[PDB]
Short mmCIF file of C-alpha atoms in Angstrom, two decimals:
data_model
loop_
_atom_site.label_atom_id
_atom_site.label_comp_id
_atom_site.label_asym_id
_atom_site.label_seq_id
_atom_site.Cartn_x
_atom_site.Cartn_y
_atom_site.Cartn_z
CA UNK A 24 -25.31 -11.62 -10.90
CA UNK A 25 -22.61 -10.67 -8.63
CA UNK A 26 -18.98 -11.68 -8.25
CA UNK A 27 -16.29 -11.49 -5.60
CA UNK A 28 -13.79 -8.37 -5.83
CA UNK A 29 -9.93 -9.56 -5.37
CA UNK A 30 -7.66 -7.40 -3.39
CA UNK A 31 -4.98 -6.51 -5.91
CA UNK A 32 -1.73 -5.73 -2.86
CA UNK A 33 -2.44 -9.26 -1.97
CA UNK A 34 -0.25 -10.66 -5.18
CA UNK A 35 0.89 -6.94 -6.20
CA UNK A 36 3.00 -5.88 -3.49
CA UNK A 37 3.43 -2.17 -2.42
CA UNK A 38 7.39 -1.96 -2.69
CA UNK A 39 10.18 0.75 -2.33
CA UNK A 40 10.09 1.04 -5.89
CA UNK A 41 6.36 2.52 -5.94
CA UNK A 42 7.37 4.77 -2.73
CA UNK A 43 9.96 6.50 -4.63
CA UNK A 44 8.20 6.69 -7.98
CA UNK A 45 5.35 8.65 -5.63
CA UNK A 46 7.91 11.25 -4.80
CA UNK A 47 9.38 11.47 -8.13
CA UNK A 48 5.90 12.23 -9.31
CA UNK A 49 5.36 14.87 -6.59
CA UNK A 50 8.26 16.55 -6.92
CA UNK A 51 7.34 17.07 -11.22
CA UNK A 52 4.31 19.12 -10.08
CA UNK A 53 2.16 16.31 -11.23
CA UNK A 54 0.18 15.69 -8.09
CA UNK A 55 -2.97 17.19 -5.87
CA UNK A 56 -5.43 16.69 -3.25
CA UNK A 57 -9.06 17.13 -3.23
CA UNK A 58 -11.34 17.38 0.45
CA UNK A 59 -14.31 18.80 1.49
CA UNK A 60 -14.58 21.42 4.32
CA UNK A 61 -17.29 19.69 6.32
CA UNK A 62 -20.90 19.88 7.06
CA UNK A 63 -21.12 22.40 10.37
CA UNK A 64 -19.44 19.96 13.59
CA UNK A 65 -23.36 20.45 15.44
CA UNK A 66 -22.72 17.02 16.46
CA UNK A 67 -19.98 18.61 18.24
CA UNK A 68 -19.89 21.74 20.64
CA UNK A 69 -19.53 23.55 16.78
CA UNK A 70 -21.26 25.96 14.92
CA UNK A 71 -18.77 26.28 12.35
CA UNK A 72 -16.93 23.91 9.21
CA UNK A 73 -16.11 21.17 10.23
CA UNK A 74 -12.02 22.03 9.56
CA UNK A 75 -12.09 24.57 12.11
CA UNK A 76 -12.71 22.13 15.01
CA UNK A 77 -9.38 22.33 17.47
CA UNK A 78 -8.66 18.80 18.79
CA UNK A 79 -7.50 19.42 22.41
CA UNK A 80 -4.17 17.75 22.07
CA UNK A 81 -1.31 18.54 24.55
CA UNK A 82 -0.46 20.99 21.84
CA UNK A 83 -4.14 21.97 20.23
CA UNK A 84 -4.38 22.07 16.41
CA UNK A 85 -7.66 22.32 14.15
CA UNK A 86 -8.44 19.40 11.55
CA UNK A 87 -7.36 22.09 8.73
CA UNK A 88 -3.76 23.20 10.27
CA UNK A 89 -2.58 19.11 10.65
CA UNK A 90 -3.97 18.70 6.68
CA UNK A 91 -1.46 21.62 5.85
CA UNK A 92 1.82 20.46 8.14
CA UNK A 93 1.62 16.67 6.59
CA UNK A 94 1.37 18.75 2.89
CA UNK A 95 4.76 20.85 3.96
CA UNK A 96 5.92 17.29 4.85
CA UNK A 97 5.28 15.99 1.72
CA UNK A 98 7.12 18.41 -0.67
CA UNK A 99 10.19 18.51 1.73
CA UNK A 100 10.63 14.56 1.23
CA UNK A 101 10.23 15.33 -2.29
CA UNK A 102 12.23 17.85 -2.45
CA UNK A 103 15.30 16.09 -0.70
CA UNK A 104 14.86 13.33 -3.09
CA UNK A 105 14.88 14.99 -6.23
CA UNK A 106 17.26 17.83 -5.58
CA UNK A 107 14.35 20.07 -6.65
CA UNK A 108 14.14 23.79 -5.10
CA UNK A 109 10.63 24.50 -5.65
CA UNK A 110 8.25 22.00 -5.06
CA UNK A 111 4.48 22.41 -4.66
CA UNK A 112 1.05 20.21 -3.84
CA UNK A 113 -2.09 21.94 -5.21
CA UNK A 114 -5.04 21.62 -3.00
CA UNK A 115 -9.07 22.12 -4.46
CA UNK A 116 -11.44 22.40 -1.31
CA UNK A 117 -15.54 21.55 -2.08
CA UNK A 118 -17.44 24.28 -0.35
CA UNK A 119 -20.64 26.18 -1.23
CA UNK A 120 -22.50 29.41 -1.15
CA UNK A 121 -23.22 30.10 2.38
CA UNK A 122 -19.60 29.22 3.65
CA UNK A 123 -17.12 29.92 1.02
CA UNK A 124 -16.39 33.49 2.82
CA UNK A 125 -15.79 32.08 5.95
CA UNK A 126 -13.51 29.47 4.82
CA UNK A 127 -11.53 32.10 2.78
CA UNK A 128 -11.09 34.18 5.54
CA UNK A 129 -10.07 31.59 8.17
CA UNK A 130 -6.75 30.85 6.17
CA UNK A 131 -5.97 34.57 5.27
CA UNK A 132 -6.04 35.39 9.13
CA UNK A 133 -3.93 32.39 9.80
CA UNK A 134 -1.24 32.90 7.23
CA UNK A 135 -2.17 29.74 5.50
CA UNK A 136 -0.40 27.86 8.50
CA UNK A 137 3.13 28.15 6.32
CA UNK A 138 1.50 27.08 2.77
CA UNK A 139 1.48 29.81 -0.12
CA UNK A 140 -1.98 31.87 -1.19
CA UNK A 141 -1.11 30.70 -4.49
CA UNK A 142 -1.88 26.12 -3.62
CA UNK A 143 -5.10 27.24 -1.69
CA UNK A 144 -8.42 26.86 -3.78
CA UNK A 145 -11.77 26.57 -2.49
CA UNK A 146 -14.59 26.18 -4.65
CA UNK A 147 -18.65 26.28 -4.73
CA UNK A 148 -21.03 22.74 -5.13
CA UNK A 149 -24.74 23.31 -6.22
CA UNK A 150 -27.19 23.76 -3.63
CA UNK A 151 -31.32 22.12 -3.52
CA UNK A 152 -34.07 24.05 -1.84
CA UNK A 153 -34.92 20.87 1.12
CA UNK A 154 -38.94 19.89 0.74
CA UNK A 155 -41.84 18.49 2.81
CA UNK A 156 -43.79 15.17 1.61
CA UNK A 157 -46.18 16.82 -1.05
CA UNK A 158 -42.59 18.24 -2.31
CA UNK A 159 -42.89 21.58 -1.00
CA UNK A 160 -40.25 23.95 -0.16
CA UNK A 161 -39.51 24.16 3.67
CA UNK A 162 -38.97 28.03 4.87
CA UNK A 163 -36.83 29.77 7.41
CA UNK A 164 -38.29 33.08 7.39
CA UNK A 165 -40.14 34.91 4.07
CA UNK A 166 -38.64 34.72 1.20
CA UNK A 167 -36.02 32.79 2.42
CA UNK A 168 -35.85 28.57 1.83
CA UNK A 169 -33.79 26.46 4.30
CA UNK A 170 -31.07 24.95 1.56
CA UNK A 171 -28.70 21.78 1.55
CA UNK A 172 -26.04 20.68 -0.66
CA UNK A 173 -26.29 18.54 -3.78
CA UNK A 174 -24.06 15.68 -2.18
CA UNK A 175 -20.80 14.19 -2.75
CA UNK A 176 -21.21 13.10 -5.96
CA UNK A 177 -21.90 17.14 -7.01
CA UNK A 178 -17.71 17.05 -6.92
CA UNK A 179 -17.10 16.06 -10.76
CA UNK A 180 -19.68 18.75 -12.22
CA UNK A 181 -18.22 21.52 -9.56
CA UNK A 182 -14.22 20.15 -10.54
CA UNK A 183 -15.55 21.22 -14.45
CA UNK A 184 -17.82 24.39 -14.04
CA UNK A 185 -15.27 26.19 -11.81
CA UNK A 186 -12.44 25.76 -14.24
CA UNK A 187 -10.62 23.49 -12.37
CA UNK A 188 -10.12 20.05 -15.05
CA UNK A 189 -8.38 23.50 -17.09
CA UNK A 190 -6.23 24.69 -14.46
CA UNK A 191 -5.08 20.91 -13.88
CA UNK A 192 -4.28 20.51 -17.43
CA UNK A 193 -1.99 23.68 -17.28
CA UNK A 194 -0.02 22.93 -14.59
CA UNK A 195 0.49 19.48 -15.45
CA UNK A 196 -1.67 17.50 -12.55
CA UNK A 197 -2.06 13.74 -13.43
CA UNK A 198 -3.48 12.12 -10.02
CA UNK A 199 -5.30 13.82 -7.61
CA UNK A 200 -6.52 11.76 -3.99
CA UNK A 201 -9.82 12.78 -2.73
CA UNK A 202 -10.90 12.13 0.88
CA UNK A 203 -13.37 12.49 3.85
CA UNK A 204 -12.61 15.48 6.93
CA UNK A 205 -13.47 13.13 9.30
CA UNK A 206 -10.12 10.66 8.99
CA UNK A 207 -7.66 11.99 11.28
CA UNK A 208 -5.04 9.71 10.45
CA UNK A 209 -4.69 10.29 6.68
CA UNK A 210 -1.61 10.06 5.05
CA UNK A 211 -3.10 12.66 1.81
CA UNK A 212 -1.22 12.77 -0.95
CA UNK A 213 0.37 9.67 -0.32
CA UNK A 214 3.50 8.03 -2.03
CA UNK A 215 2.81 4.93 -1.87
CA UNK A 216 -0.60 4.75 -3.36
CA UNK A 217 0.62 7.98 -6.16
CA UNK A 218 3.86 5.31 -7.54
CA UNK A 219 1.34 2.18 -7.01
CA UNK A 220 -1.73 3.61 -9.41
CA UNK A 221 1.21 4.91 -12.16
CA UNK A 222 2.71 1.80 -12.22
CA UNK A 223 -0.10 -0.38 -12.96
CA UNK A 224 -1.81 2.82 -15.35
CA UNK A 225 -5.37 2.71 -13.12
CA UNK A 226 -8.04 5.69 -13.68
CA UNK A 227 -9.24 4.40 -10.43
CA UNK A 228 -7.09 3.53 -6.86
CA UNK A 229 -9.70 2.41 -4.25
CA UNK A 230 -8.82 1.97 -0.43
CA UNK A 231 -10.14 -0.34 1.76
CA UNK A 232 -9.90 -2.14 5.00
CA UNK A 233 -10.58 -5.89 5.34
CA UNK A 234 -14.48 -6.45 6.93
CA UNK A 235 -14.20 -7.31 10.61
CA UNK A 236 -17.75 -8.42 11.50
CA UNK A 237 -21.23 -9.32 9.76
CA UNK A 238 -22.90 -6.31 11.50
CA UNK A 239 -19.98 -3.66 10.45
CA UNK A 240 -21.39 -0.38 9.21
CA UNK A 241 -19.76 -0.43 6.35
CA UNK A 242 -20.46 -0.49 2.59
CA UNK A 243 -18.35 -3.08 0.53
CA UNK A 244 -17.32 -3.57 -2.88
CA UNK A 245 -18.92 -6.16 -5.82
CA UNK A 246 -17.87 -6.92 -9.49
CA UNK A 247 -21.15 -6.97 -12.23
CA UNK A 248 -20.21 -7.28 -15.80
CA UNK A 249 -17.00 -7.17 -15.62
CA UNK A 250 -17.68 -3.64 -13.46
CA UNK A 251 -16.56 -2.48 -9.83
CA UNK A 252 -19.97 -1.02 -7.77
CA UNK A 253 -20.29 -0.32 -3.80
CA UNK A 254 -23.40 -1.67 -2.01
CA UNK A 255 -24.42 0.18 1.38
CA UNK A 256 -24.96 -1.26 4.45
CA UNK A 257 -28.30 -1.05 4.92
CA UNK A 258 -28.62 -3.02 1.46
CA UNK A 259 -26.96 -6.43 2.41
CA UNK A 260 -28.00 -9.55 1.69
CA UNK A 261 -27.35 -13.11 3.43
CA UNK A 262 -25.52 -13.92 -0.26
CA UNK A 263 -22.94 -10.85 0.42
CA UNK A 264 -22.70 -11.62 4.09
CA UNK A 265 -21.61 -15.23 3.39
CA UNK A 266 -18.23 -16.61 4.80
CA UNK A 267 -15.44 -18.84 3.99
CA UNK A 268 -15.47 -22.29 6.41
CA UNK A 269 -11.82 -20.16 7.95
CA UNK A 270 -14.63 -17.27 8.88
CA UNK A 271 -13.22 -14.91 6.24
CA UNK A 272 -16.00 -12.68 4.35
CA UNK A 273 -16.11 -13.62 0.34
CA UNK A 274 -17.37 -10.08 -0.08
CA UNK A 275 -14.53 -8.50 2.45
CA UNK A 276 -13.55 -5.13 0.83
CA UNK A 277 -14.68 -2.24 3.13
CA UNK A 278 -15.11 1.17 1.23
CA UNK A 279 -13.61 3.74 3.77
CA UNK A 280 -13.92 6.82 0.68
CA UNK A 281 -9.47 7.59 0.39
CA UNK A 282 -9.75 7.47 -3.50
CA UNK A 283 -7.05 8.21 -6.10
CA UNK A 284 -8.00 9.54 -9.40
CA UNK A 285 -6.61 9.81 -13.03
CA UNK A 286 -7.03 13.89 -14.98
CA UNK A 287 -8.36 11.39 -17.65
CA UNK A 288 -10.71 10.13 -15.83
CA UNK A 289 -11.77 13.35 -13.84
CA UNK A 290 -13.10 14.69 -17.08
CA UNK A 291 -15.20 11.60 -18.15
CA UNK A 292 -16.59 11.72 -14.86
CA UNK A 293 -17.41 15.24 -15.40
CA UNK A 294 -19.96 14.18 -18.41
CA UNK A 295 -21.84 11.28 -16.70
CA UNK A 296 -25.17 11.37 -14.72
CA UNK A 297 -25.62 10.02 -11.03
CA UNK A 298 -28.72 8.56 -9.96
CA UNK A 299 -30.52 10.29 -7.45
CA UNK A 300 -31.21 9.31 -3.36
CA UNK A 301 -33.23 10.19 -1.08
CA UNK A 302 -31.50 11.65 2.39
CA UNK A 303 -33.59 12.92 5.97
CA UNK A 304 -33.01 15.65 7.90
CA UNK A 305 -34.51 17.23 10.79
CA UNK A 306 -36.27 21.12 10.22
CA UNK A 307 -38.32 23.34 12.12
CA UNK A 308 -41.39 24.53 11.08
CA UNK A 309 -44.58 26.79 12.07
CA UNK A 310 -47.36 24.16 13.30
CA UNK A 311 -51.65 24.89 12.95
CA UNK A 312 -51.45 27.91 15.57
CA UNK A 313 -47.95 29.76 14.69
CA UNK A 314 -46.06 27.97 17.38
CA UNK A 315 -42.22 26.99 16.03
CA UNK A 316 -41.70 23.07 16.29
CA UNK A 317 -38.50 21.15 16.74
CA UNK A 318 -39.32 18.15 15.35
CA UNK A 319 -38.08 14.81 17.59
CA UNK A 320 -37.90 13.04 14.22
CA UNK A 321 -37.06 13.28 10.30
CA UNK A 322 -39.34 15.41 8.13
CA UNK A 323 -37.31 17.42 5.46
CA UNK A 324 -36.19 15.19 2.13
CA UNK A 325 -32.84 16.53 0.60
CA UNK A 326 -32.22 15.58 -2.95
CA UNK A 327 -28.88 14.09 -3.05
CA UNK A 328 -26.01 12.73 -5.89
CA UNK A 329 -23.25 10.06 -4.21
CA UNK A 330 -19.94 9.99 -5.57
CA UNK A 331 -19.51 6.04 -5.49
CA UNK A 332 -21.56 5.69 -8.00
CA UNK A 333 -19.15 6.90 -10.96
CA UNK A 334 -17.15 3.48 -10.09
CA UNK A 335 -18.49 1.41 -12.91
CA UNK A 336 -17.59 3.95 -15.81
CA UNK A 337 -14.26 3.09 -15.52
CA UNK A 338 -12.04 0.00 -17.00
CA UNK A 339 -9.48 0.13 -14.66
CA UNK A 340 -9.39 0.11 -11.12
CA UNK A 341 -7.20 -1.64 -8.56
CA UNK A 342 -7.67 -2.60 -4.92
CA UNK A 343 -5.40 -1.19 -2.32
CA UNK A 344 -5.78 -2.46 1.29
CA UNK A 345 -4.62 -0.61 4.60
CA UNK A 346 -3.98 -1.34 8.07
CA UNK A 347 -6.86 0.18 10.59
CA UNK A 348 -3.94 0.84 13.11
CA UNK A 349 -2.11 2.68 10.65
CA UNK A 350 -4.41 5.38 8.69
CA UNK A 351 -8.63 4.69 10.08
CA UNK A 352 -9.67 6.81 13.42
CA UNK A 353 -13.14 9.10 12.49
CA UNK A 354 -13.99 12.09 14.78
CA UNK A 355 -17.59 12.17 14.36
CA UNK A 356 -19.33 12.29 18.24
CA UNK A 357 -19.32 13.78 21.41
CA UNK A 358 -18.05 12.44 24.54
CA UNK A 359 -21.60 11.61 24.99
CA UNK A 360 -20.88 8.33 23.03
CA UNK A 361 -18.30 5.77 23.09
CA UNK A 362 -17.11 5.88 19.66
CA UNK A 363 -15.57 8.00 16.47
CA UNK A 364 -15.09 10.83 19.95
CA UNK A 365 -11.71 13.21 21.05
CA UNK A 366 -10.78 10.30 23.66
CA UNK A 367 -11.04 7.55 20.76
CA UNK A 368 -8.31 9.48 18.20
CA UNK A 369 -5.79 10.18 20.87
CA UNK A 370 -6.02 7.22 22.11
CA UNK A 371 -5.41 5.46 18.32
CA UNK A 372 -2.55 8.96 17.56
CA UNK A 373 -0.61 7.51 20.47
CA UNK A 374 -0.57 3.97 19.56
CA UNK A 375 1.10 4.91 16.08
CA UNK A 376 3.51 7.42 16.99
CA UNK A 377 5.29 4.94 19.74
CA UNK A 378 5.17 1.80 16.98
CA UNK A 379 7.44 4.50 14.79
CA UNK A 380 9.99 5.03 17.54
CA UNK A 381 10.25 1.45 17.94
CA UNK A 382 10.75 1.00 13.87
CA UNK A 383 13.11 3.76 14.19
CA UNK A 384 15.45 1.51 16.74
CA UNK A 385 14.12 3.56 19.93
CA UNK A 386 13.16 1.94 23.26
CA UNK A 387 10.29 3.31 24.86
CA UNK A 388 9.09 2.86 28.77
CA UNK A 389 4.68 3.82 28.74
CA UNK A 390 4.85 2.42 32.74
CA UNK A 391 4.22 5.74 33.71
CA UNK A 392 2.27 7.72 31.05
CA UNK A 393 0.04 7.02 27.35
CA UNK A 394 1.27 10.48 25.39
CA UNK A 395 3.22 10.58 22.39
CA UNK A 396 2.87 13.40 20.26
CA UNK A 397 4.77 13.42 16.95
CA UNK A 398 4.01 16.89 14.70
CA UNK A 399 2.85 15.99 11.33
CA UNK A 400 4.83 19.09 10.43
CA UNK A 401 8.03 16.68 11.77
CA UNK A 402 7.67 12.93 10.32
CA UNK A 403 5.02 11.03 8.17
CA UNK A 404 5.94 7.67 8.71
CA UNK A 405 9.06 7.07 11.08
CA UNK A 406 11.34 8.55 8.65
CA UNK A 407 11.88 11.63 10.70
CA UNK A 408 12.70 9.48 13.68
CA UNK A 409 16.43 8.33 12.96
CA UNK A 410 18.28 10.40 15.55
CA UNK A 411 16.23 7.87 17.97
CA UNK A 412 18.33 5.19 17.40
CA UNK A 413 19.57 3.23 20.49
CA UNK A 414 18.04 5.78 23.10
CA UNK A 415 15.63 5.11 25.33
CA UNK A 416 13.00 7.68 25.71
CA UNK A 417 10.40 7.44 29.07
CA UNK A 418 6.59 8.95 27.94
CA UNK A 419 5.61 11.84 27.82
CA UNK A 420 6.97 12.11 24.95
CA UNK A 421 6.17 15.71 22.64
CA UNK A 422 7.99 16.56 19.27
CA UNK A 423 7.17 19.99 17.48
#
């Protein structure tokens, strides 16, 4: 049956040593990072990718332009390291059919925020016609079906069929991370978990945070045969909600999807079939006497593939586990909720950016004011932070 899963940093350590390996590694061209551009932010005031959303900072940025500052970041720190001129992060971006010119477009118009036309790749998922419940194809207007994507788990087929595995092989990639738009705080390519999966030769690096509550909706992870798997929330049991008599969880490894892959083991993944799920949506429709409903509850099926579900193919896998304070604050509501909102993210941004000037040797006074605004294009961890020493700096704080 199942087993416990033991978090491998707790007798591993993440050290300097890994750090530096990470940026040796980058610097080689032997890195990349893999996201998708979003459902459309509807939950949101937006009609658009989800990228596109501006968070209304002091200084306002969109979710895409702060993903390409901390990737300039990343190859300077690299490059200063190494003593290498040229240094460069690839980056493949999941998108489909109906958005792919859009997306395209948005980053010629913008210059690609400082990043060359040459790291920029966006490429098309499969798309499912979505169905009633005698299976029958739900229509927007004749001739024309409403259509969803295949879900996550389409990324491994898309990575192969679009040339991709190829291209990685020619320029030398060996570990790509792939994560979720909605993380604000994500460190991307990072160098501590790039040196940390090299070291101990994993095809798999897995994130997590430590479970802080029974009802937590969040999946977690098990061990069967020898195998890692994730179980979703909604399919706990009172055996994998049991505690230690300290009130620790036994099954305490919260999936949060910041996953570091192998080339290797990008193109078994490529070969292996996903089980399919069932996911509900919301369409409108033409009732009994041509009136167009808006339906106050589910009624279209989508077909969907989950990505999680390639974890037991592989042999080896560790277990690396982050701080929520340091990289886990979603934007996924309005201000109409109380949670995962605008208020909620600047609120965690803050919090970081003043524990760095204190790591850095600054003193800082908040009596007066909450903002501290640090550009990712600037630091990504305190490192940038050093001519702070000894001074003593009174909020507002902004650094650009």
């Amino acid at each position: 049956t199942y087993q416990p899963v033991d978090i491998t940093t707790n007798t591993i350590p993440v050290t300097k040593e890994h750090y530096y390996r990470g940026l040796e590694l980058i610097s080689q061209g032997k890195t990349a990072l893999i996201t998708p551009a979003g459902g459309q932010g509807s939950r949101l005031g937006f009609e658009h990718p989800k990228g596109m959303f501006v968070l209304p900072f002091e200084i306002p940025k969109s979710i895409f332009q702060m993903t390409s500052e901390r990737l300039l970041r990343l190859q300077e720190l690299a490059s200063e390291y190494s003593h290498q001129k040229n240094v460069m992060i690839h980056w493949f971006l999941m998108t489909n059919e109906e958005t792919i010119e859009e997306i395209n477009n948005y980053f010629k118009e913008h210059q690609y925020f400082g990043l060359s036309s040459e790291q920029i790749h966006c490429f098309p998922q499969g798309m499912l016609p979505v169905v009633d419940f005698n299976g029958k194809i739900l229509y927007e207007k004749k001739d024309k079906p409403y259509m969803a994507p295949n879900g996550h788990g389409g990324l491994f087929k898309a990575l192969k069929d679009n040339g991709i595995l190829e291209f990685m092989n020619e320029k030398g990639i060996k570990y790509s991370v792939a994560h979720n738009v909605d993380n604000i705080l994500c460190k991307d390519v990072d160098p501590n978990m790039i040196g940390y999966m090299d070291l101990l030769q994993s095809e798999i690096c897995i994130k997590i945070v430590k479970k802080g509550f029974k009802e937590e909706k969040v999946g977690v992870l098990v061990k069967e045969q020898e195998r890692i798997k994730v179980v979703e929330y909604t399919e706990l049991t009172d055996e994998l909600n049991k505690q230690l008599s300290n009130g620790e969880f036994i099954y305490n490894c919260g999936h949060i999807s910041i996953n570091g892959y192998s080339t290797s083991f990008l193109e078994k993944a490529a070969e292996y079939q996903l089980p399919y799920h069932i996911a509900k949506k919301k369409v409108p429709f033409v009732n009994e006497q041509g009136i167009v409903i808006h339906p106050s509850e589910n009624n279209g099926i989508k077909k969907e593939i989950f990505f999680f579900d390639v974890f037991p193919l592989a042999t080896k896998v560790s277990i690396f586990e982050i701080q929520r304070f340091i990289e886990f604050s979603a934007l996924k509501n309005s201000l109409n909720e109380s949670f995962d909102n605008v208020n909620t993210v600047k609120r965690d941004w803050y919090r970081l950016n003043i524990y760095y000037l204190k790591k850095a040797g600054a003193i800082v006074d908040d009596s007066k004011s909450p903002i501290c605004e640090i550009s990712f294009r600037k630091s990504f961890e305190e490192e940038g932070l050093k001519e702070f020493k000894g001074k003593t700096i009174q909020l507002p704080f902004i650094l650009q």
